[PDB]
Recover the amino acids of this structure.
């Protein structure tokens, strides 16, 4: 009920702070996804770290 | 509920293990006696008239 | 315990609201349909947590 | 040490701790038991939830990841392991368990549908990153005034 329909017209916030925050979060999420993929390379390293 | 646990043996095993653990913990803390408080309480009123 | 449990209790609400938001932002569903879909998705996860 | 001292005394004199010392002597040794029983209960609940004896081991391995941080924060500020600390540790264990639960349950469902293991876990992490960071930051700033 409270949630309005998606602000498709607004789309990206394009605020002084929010657009930059979204871009930062997206690129950091890509970096995180790459970092998780490194478990395929050598899981022994992080086992020893654990 | 029978058909539910037929496909989920792990759930039933967890429930059984939990019951066993609770019972085992209870046994080591349960008081032991011949009878419960079966004896009716007695109250004695004593007065002396020399 | 009240203060310490503030984050714990907002966890479930955040999960549900964020799931609805991402569902409607990606699938483009109506808010009611999006809420229904999100509840179907994460009904058991909240119970487990 | 005081018991050693009173032992050094001549015979016939003994000590009996009273009030706060008496109660402190009574308690304080129930911690490790609590932790062990709580961890066992959590493992059993996870086994019930995921219908496996393996997935809980995946979840239960993140308890140390929160315990180490809580211990490091406590020691760094020079605090002490006390009742408040213990309850904190239990809260940290619970939150770490929840954070693990989100990812592992989503990945388990994804691979159950038929997806590749790496693909399933990567997709689950990508989706659940925002809820995890959001909830965790909300909690951290929630207890931030307490720490300061």
């Amino acid at each position: 009920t409270l949630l309005k329909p998606l602000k498709k017209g607004e789309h990206h916030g394009q605020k002084g702070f929010f657009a930059w925050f979204n871009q930062m979060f997206n690129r950091n999420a890509e970096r995180y996804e790459k970092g998780v993929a490194k478990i395929l390379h050598r899981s022994l390293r992080w086992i020893v770290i654990y | 509920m029978a058909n539910f646990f037929i496909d989920r043996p792990i759930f039933a095993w967890v429930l059984a293990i939990l019951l066993c653990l609770t019972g085992t913990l209870a046994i080591f803390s349960l008081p032991v006696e011949q009878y419960p408080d079966l004896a009716p309480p007695n109250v004695r009123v004593t007065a002396n008239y020399p | 315990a009240m203060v310490l449990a503030i984050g714990l209790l907002v966890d479930d609400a955040i999960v549900v609201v964020e799931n609805v938001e991402r569902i409607m932002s990606e699938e483009g569903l109506t808010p009611r349909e999006a809420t229904r879909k999100s509840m179907g998705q994460i009904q058991g996860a909240l119970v487990g947590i | 040490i005081m018991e050693s001292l009173v032992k050094q005394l001549p015979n016939g004199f003994g000590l009996e701790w009273t009030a706060m010392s008496y109660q402190e002597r009574l308690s304080g040794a129930q911690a490790p038991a609590l932790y062990a029983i709580s961890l066992l209960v959590v493992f059993l609940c996870l086994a019930a939830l995921y219908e496996s004896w393996s997935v809980p081991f995946s979840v239960m391995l993140v308890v140390p990841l929160g315990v180490i941080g809580a211990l490091l924060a406590t020691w760094m500020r020079g605090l002490e392991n006390d009742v408040y600390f213990q309850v904190g540790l239990l809260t940290v264990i619970g939150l770490s368990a929840k954070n693990a639960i989100l990812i592992v349950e989503f990945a388990n469902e994804m691979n159950q549908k038929g997806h590749d293991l790496f693909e399933a876990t990567l997709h689950a992490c990508r989706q659940r990153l925002r809820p995890i960071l959001m909830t965790s930051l909300a909690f951290i700033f929630g207890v931030l005034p307490m720490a300061t």
Observations:
- Helices of chain D lie at 2-8, 20-26, 31-50, 55-60, 63-76, 83-113, 117-147.
